[PDB]
PDB file of C-alpha atoms in Angstrom:
ATOM      1  CA  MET A   1      98.894  97.447 120.689  1.00  0.00           C
ATOM      2  CA  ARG A   2      95.412  98.955 119.354  1.00  0.00           C
ATOM      3  CA  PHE A   3      94.710 100.858 116.164  1.00  0.00           C
ATOM      4  CA  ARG A   4      91.861 103.405 115.912  1.00  0.00           C
ATOM      5  CA  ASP A   5      91.563 102.310 112.122  1.00  0.00           C
ATOM      6  CA  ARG A   6      93.463 101.478 109.603  1.00  0.00           C
ATOM      7  CA  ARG A   7      94.435 104.858 108.326  1.00  0.00           C
ATOM      8  CA  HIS A   8      95.591 105.429 111.889  1.00  0.00           C
ATOM      9  CA  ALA A   9      97.668 102.614 111.718  1.00  0.00           C
ATOM     10  CA  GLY A  10      99.225 103.488 107.983  1.00  0.00           C
ATOM     11  CA  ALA A  11     100.174 106.932 109.634  1.00  0.00           C
ATOM     12  CA  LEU A  12     102.348 105.334 112.711  1.00  0.00           C
ATOM     13  CA  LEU A  13     103.725 102.822 109.709  1.00  0.00           C
ATOM     14  CA  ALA A  14     104.809 105.487 107.692  1.00  0.00           C
ATOM     15  CA  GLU A  15     106.608 107.049 110.453  1.00  0.00           C
ATOM     16  CA  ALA A  16     108.446 103.863 111.305  1.00  0.00           C
ATOM     17  CA  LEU A  17     109.376 103.803 108.113  1.00  0.00           C
ATOM     18  CA  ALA A  18     110.656 107.016 107.221  1.00  0.00           C
ATOM     19  CA  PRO A  19     114.186 106.396 108.898  1.00  0.00           C
ATOM     20  CA  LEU A  20     114.938 103.740 106.577  1.00  0.00           C
ATOM     21  CA  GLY A  21     116.154 106.108 103.308  1.00  0.00           C
ATOM     22  CA  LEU A  22     113.716 104.735 101.396  1.00  0.00           C
ATOM     23  CA  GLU A  23     113.326 106.957  97.813  1.00  0.00           C
ATOM     24  CA  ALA A  24     110.358 107.488  96.390  1.00  0.00           C
ATOM     25  CA  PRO A  25     108.836 104.066  97.069  1.00  0.00           C
ATOM     26  CA  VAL A  26     106.307 102.035  94.958  1.00  0.00           C
ATOM     27  CA  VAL A  27     104.024 100.989  98.279  1.00  0.00           C
ATOM     28  CA  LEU A  28     102.226  98.189  97.254  1.00  0.00           C
ATOM     29  CA  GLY A  29      99.197  97.033  99.109  1.00  0.00           C
ATOM     30  CA  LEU A  30      97.546  93.356  99.681  1.00  0.00           C
ATOM     31  CA  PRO A  31      93.954  93.291  98.805  1.00  0.00           C
ATOM     32  CA  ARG A  32      91.839  94.482 100.574  1.00  0.00           C
ATOM     33  CA  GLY A  33      92.214  96.202 103.646  1.00  0.00           C
ATOM     34  CA  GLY A  34      95.780  96.436 103.106  1.00  0.00           C
ATOM     35  CA  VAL A  35      95.076  99.089 100.241  1.00  0.00           C
ATOM     36  CA  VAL A  36      93.579 101.626 102.953  1.00  0.00           C
ATOM     37  CA  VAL A  37      97.146 101.431 104.913  1.00  0.00           C
ATOM     38  CA  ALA A  38      99.219 101.198 102.061  1.00  0.00           C
ATOM     39  CA  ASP A  39      97.600 104.569 100.512  1.00  0.00           C
ATOM     40  CA  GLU A  40      98.052 106.524 103.869  1.00  0.00           C
ATOM     41  CA  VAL A  41     101.656 105.218 103.672  1.00  0.00           C
ATOM     42  CA  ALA A  42     102.168 106.112 100.029  1.00  0.00           C
ATOM     43  CA  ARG A  43     100.887 109.770 100.741  1.00  0.00           C
ATOM     44  CA  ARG A  44     103.144 110.099 104.108  1.00  0.00           C
ATOM     45  CA  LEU A  45     106.130 108.985 101.909  1.00  0.00           C
ATOM     46  CA  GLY A  46     105.678 110.866  98.869  1.00  0.00           C
ATOM     47  CA  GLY A  47     105.735 107.559  97.060  1.00  0.00           C
ATOM     48  CA  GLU A  48     103.230 105.769  94.621  1.00  0.00           C
ATOM     49  CA  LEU A  49     100.554 103.673  95.515  1.00  0.00           C
ATOM     50  CA  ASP A  50      99.414 100.334  93.801  1.00  0.00           C
ATOM     51  CA  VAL A  51      98.106  97.097  94.638  1.00  0.00           C
ATOM     52  CA  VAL A  52      99.819  93.741  94.544  1.00  0.00           C
ATOM     53  CA  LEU A  53      97.893  90.780  92.782  1.00  0.00           C
ATOM     54  CA  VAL A  54      98.620  87.294  93.626  1.00  0.00           C
ATOM     55  CA  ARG A  55      97.993  84.190  94.362  1.00  0.00           C
ATOM     56  CA  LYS A  56      99.694  81.112  96.541  1.00  0.00           C
ATOM     57  CA  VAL A  57     100.190  77.690  94.828  1.00  0.00           C
ATOM     58  CA  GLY A  58      99.546  74.851  97.717  1.00  0.00           C
ATOM     59  CA  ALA A  59     100.892  71.480  98.172  1.00  0.00           C
ATOM     60  CA  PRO A  60      98.994  68.399  97.512  1.00  0.00           C
ATOM     61  CA  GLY A  61      96.500  67.822  99.813  1.00  0.00           C
ATOM     62  CA  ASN A  62      97.971  70.814 102.142  1.00  0.00           C
ATOM     63  CA  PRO A  63      96.865  73.816 100.654  1.00  0.00           C
ATOM     64  CA  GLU A  64      98.271  75.663 103.530  1.00  0.00           C
ATOM     65  CA  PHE A  65     102.032  74.607 102.847  1.00  0.00           C
ATOM     66  CA  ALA A  66     103.202  77.065  99.847  1.00  0.00           C
ATOM     67  CA  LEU A  67     104.737  75.662  96.669  1.00  0.00           C
ATOM     68  CA  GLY A  68     105.025  78.681  94.906  1.00  0.00           C
ATOM     69  CA  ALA A  69     102.933  81.426  93.846  1.00  0.00           C
ATOM     70  CA  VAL A  70     101.431  83.075  90.664  1.00  0.00           C
ATOM     71  CA  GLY A  71     101.577  87.023  89.897  1.00  0.00           C
ATOM     72  CA  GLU A  72      98.693  88.954  87.934  1.00  0.00           C
ATOM     73  CA  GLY A  73     100.601  88.723  84.967  1.00  0.00           C
ATOM     74  CA  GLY A  74     100.257  84.900  84.837  1.00  0.00           C
ATOM     75  CA  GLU A  75     103.902  83.891  85.489  1.00  0.00           C
ATOM     76  CA  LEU A  76     104.360  80.870  87.880  1.00  0.00           C
ATOM     77  CA  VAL A  77     107.111  81.160  90.165  1.00  0.00           C
ATOM     78  CA  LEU A  78     108.489  78.339  92.218  1.00  0.00           C
ATOM     79  CA  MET A  79     109.789  77.384  95.464  1.00  0.00           C
ATOM     80  CA  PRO A  80     113.700  75.645  95.343  1.00  0.00           C
ATOM     81  CA  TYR A  81     111.922  72.529  96.913  1.00  0.00           C
ATOM     82  CA  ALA A  82     108.696  72.367  94.952  1.00  0.00           C
ATOM     83  CA  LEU A  83     109.520  69.492  92.606  1.00  0.00           C
ATOM     84  CA  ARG A  84     110.078  67.561  95.814  1.00  0.00           C
ATOM     85  CA  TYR A  85     106.699  67.674  97.139  1.00  0.00           C
ATOM     86  CA  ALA A  86     105.017  67.360  93.693  1.00  0.00           C
ATOM     87  CA  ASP A  87     105.315  66.919  89.924  1.00  0.00           C
ATOM     88  CA  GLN A  88     105.193  69.495  87.067  1.00  0.00           C
ATOM     89  CA  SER A  89     101.823  68.411  86.058  1.00  0.00           C
ATOM     90  CA  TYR A  90     100.375  68.976  89.875  1.00  0.00           C
ATOM     91  CA  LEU A  91     102.140  72.414  89.850  1.00  0.00           C
ATOM     92  CA  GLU A  92     100.368  73.500  86.295  1.00  0.00           C
ATOM     93  CA  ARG A  93      97.394  72.527  87.592  1.00  0.00           C
ATOM     94  CA  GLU A  94      97.453  74.056  90.455  1.00  0.00           C
ATOM     95  CA  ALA A  95      98.428  77.522  89.088  1.00  0.00           C
ATOM     96  CA  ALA A  96      95.677  77.202  86.318  1.00  0.00           C
ATOM     97  CA  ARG A  97      93.151  77.155  89.626  1.00  0.00           C
ATOM     98  CA  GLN A  98      94.608  80.203  91.189  1.00  0.00           C
ATOM     99  CA  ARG A  99      94.732  82.202  87.622  1.00  0.00           C
ATOM    100  CA  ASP A 100      91.235  82.150  87.682  1.00  0.00           C
ATOM    101  CA  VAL A 101      90.882  83.118  91.250  1.00  0.00           C
ATOM    102  CA  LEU A 102      93.127  86.100  90.624  1.00  0.00           C
ATOM    103  CA  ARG A 103      91.892  87.205  86.602  1.00  0.00           C
ATOM    104  CA  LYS A 104      88.591  88.957  87.055  1.00  0.00           C
ATOM    105  CA  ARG A 105      89.812  90.828  90.092  1.00  0.00           C
ATOM    106  CA  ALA A 106      92.759  91.969  88.393  1.00  0.00           C
ATOM    107  CA  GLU A 107      91.089  92.781  85.321  1.00  0.00           C
ATOM    108  CA  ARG A 108      88.930  95.608  86.830  1.00  0.00           C
ATOM    109  CA  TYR A 109      91.384  96.966  88.986  1.00  0.00           C
ATOM    110  CA  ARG A 110      93.815  97.493  86.160  1.00  0.00           C
ATOM    111  CA  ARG A 111      91.125  99.368  84.455  1.00  0.00           C
ATOM    112  CA  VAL A 112      91.078 102.049  86.695  1.00  0.00           C
ATOM    113  CA  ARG A 113      94.850 102.009  87.610  1.00  0.00           C
ATOM    114  CA  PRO A 114      97.643 100.544  85.468  1.00  0.00           C
ATOM    115  CA  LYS A 115     100.351  98.333  87.254  1.00  0.00           C
ATOM    116  CA  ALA A 116     103.250 100.737  88.455  1.00  0.00           C
ATOM    117  CA  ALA A 117     106.611 100.227  87.410  1.00  0.00           C
ATOM    118  CA  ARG A 118     108.911  97.693  89.824  1.00  0.00           C
ATOM    119  CA  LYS A 119     112.337  97.398  88.424  1.00  0.00           C
ATOM    120  CA  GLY A 120     115.064  99.194  90.198  1.00  0.00           C
ATOM    121  CA  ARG A 121     112.729 100.812  92.366  1.00  0.00           C
ATOM    122  CA  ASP A 122     112.327 101.056  96.374  1.00  0.00           C
ATOM    123  CA  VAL A 123     109.488  98.551  96.955  1.00  0.00           C
ATOM    124  CA  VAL A 124     107.297  98.611 100.303  1.00  0.00           C
ATOM    125  CA  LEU A 125     104.704  95.411 101.014  1.00  0.00           C
ATOM    126  CA  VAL A 126     101.663  96.639 103.049  1.00  0.00           C
ATOM    127  CA  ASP A 127      98.875  94.858 104.498  1.00  0.00           C
ATOM    128  CA  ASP A 128      96.836  95.978 107.829  1.00  0.00           C
ATOM    129  CA  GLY A 129      97.864  92.515 109.603  1.00  0.00           C
ATOM    130  CA  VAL A 130      99.797  89.274 109.264  1.00  0.00           C
ATOM    131  CA  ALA A 131      98.808  86.499 111.348  1.00  0.00           C
ATOM    132  CA  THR A 132     100.646  83.457 109.263  1.00  0.00           C
ATOM    133  CA  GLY A 133     102.210  85.538 106.372  1.00  0.00           C
ATOM    134  CA  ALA A 134     100.937  83.314 103.439  1.00  0.00           C
ATOM    135  CA  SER A 135      99.747  85.777 101.234  1.00  0.00           C
ATOM    136  CA  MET A 136     102.625  88.136 102.007  1.00  0.00           C
ATOM    137  CA  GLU A 137     104.865  85.459 101.108  1.00  0.00           C
ATOM    138  CA  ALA A 138     103.201  84.720  97.710  1.00  0.00           C
ATOM    139  CA  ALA A 139     103.989  88.445  97.207  1.00  0.00           C
ATOM    140  CA  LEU A 140     107.427  88.583  98.077  1.00  0.00           C
ATOM    141  CA  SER A 141     107.828  85.407  95.867  1.00  0.00           C
ATOM    142  CA  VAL A 142     106.675  87.421  92.606  1.00  0.00           C
ATOM    143  CA  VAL A 143     108.116  90.787  93.404  1.00  0.00           C
ATOM    144  CA  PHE A 144     111.829  89.392  93.900  1.00  0.00           C
ATOM    145  CA  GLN A 145     111.523  87.987  90.405  1.00  0.00           C
ATOM    146  CA  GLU A 146     110.408  91.401  89.394  1.00  0.00           C
ATOM    147  CA  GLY A 147     114.176  92.981  89.719  1.00  0.00           C
ATOM    148  CA  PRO A 148     113.243  95.811  92.586  1.00  0.00           C
ATOM    149  CA  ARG A 149     116.383  97.395  94.204  1.00  0.00           C
ATOM    150  CA  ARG A 150     114.974  96.796  97.260  1.00  0.00           C
ATOM    151  CA  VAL A 151     112.018  95.230  99.093  1.00  0.00           C
ATOM    152  CA  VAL A 152     110.656  95.924 102.818  1.00  0.00           C
ATOM    153  CA  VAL A 153     107.539  94.578 104.173  1.00  0.00           C
ATOM    154  CA  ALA A 154     105.950  96.719 106.593  1.00  0.00           C
ATOM    155  CA  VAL A 155     102.593  95.745 108.747  1.00  0.00           C
ATOM    156  CA  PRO A 156     100.897  97.276 111.647  1.00  0.00           C
ATOM    157  CA  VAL A 157     100.798  94.229 113.714  1.00  0.00           C
ATOM    158  CA  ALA A 158     101.866  90.734 112.887  1.00  0.00           C
ATOM    159  CA  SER A 159     102.190  87.073 114.993  1.00  0.00           C
ATOM    160  CA  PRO A 160     105.782  86.100 116.182  1.00  0.00           C
ATOM    161  CA  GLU A 161     105.453  83.171 113.410  1.00  0.00           C
ATOM    162  CA  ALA A 162     104.702  85.546 110.712  1.00  0.00           C
ATOM    163  CA  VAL A 163     107.760  87.872 111.699  1.00  0.00           C
ATOM    164  CA  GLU A 164     110.267  84.928 111.607  1.00  0.00           C
ATOM    165  CA  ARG A 165     108.703  83.462 107.977  1.00  0.00           C
ATOM    166  CA  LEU A 166     109.161  86.658 106.845  1.00  0.00           C
ATOM    167  CA  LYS A 167     112.184  88.292 108.270  1.00  0.00           C
ATOM    168  CA  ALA A 168     113.923  85.051 106.987  1.00  0.00           C
ATOM    169  CA  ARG A 169     113.439  86.390 103.670  1.00  0.00           C
ATOM    170  CA  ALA A 170     113.363  90.325 104.050  1.00  0.00           C
ATOM    171  CA  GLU A 171     113.493  93.306 106.062  1.00  0.00           C
ATOM    172  CA  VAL A 172     110.436  93.917 108.103  1.00  0.00           C
ATOM    173  CA  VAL A 173     109.087  96.578 109.817  1.00  0.00           C
ATOM    174  CA  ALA A 174     106.380  95.609 112.307  1.00  0.00           C
ATOM    175  CA  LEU A 175     104.861  98.117 114.788  1.00  0.00           C
ATOM    176  CA  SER A 176     103.356  95.311 117.230  1.00  0.00           C
ATOM    177  CA  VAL A 177     104.196  91.668 117.631  1.00  0.00           C
ATOM    178  CA  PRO A 178     102.003  90.570 120.322  1.00  0.00           C
ATOM    179  CA  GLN A 179     103.295  87.167 122.326  1.00  0.00           C
ATOM    180  CA  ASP A 180      99.708  86.262 122.612  1.00  0.00           C
ATOM    181  CA  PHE A 181      98.464  87.554 118.957  1.00  0.00           C
ATOM    182  CA  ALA A 182      94.979  86.892 118.720  1.00  0.00           C
ATOM    183  CA  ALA A 183      93.469  88.157 115.344  1.00  0.00           C
ATOM    184  CA  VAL A 184      94.142  91.155 112.890  1.00  0.00           C
ATOM    185  CA  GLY A 185      90.918  92.465 113.463  1.00  0.00           C
ATOM    186  CA  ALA A 186      91.296  92.651 117.492  1.00  0.00           C
ATOM    187  CA  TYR A 187      93.900  95.515 117.087  1.00  0.00           C
ATOM    188  CA  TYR A 188      91.750  97.830 115.434  1.00  0.00           C
ATOM    189  CA  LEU A 189      88.849  99.756 116.933  1.00  0.00           C
ATOM    190  CA  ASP A 190      87.473 100.281 113.570  1.00  0.00           C
ATOM    191  CA  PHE A 191      87.811  96.909 111.219  1.00  0.00           C
ATOM    192  CA  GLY A 192      85.319  98.139 108.654  1.00  0.00           C
ATOM    193  CA  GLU A 193      84.719  96.157 105.728  1.00  0.00           C
ATOM    194  CA  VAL A 194      86.738  97.187 102.465  1.00  0.00           C
ATOM    195  CA  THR A 195      84.999  96.614  99.142  1.00  0.00           C
ATOM    196  CA  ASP A 196      86.503  95.956  95.689  1.00  0.00           C
ATOM    197  CA  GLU A 197      84.769  99.389  94.645  1.00  0.00           C
ATOM    198  CA  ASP A 198      86.954 100.844  97.871  1.00  0.00           C
ATOM    199  CA  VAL A 199      89.802  99.649  96.303  1.00  0.00           C
ATOM    200  CA  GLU A 200      88.912 100.475  93.121  1.00  0.00           C
ATOM    201  CA  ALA A 201      88.052 104.507  94.220  1.00  0.00           C
ATOM    202  CA  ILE A 202      91.788 104.271  95.993  1.00  0.00           C
ATOM    203  CA  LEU A 203      93.474 103.163  92.796  1.00  0.00           C
ATOM    204  CA  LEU A 204      91.566 105.968  90.799  1.00  0.00           C
ATOM    205  CA  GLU A 205      93.116 108.709  92.576  1.00  0.00           C
ATOM    206  CA  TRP A 206      96.962 107.039  91.473  1.00  0.00           C
ATOM    207  CA  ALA A 207      96.083 106.885  87.774  1.00  0.00           C
ATOM    208  CA  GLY A 208      97.143 109.466  85.019  1.00  0.00           C
TER     209      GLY A 208
END
């Protein structure tokens, strides 16, 4: 496909989601470009926009392989096989390093918009694209432990591989899944930078 920009993809995504019957959904966008797509979706579906703040906890010597994830609240969420690939002390060391990467950014975002409730509500996870699904999987791991009524992964474009990984864990809504997936930015005419200040500006509109 080929979107003009992130707002354009967000509009089309909201339209693909409308038939699902979500009720006043909490639309969570992955930082940073994903927040733009998420905001447009939230506005079109009459939902509430917020950001999902998480980090993947990778395996020893193999960071690309996830053994769990840590959320902005500090909680460590491990996959069923984590201990089969590493000992608890390593997991604790890795978790601490990931908390550091997330801390300052989470503090500034939360200063302008407090974490919206997710328990018992319909939750939509959004990003402007998914090449491998690493971050999205971490997001799912944390969100699932929060007791949401329903979880839907929604993305403008995704690689076949990413879709399979995510679809194995949740309902997935993807507008395009090119068999020859290049890079996320290749499917946007305007793939400009979205700064932390831009994310803060968006988040401010949703605070009380």
